[PDB]
Fold this protein.
Amino acid sequence: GCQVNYCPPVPCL
Amino acid sequence: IIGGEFTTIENQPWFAAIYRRHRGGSVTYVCGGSLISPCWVISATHCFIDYPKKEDYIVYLGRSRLNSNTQGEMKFEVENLILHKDYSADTLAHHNDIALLKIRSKEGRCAQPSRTIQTIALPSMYNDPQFGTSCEITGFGKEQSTDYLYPEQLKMTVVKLISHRECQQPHYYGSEVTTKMLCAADPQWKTDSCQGDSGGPLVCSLQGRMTLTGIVSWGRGCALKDKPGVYTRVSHFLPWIRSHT
Ligand SMILES: *CC(=O)Nc1cc(NC(=O)C*)cc(NC(=O)C*)c1
């Protein structure tokens, strides 16, 4: 998933 | 990398591209890293902490593109994956975000230096670059936070080091940054690391020498006002590095 990232997820365009 | 330029591996010959193979055989990009000696790549622990099985990883050196080949590139298995025992994170900051990968060719060898494959010098805890210094960051990370896909080619940009005092202000990162981290950003907040750039090098020129000053670790965003990129401060982990290499 996206619990570990560089930075909090941003919705895609 | 937000902003900056496309680059080629000649301009960053220590850059290591790290991929992971999945159960069914598909291979995805994980993170950047830096070659610090022929057998050792240094990266960030958060890149691997959810999937720490070394056999799944593929490391390339001499590679300028994400899914096409570069003449002179060399491919490696990971013989040892070493994560920092005191790694921790909250919902934003990563602490002790540093990792070592011992690399091994199909043929049982370490890297052979070339024009496109070179080690980068480690820093010294006595030789810090001062705040306001310009340093280079490199990686295959997103060109925008809203991009689903990574770029097909390596990018690089320039950011300026920000003092700990400044980065610890409430309107920057307050208590989330420590003396084992370095902040860096564009004065106008238009170029930065982003998702996919983690583990990659922050390189500063000290006495004319390219030196590994930081490892891309975390940020609140990508090119975001009053929210710098945050890097593991390599000079504060020299004992850890020497113990494990
Ligand atoms: C796991 C994952 O998809 N993470 C992810 C993180 C970011 N972070 C920032 O941009 C700060 C962005 C995205 N964006 C997209 O996938 C569109 C994903």
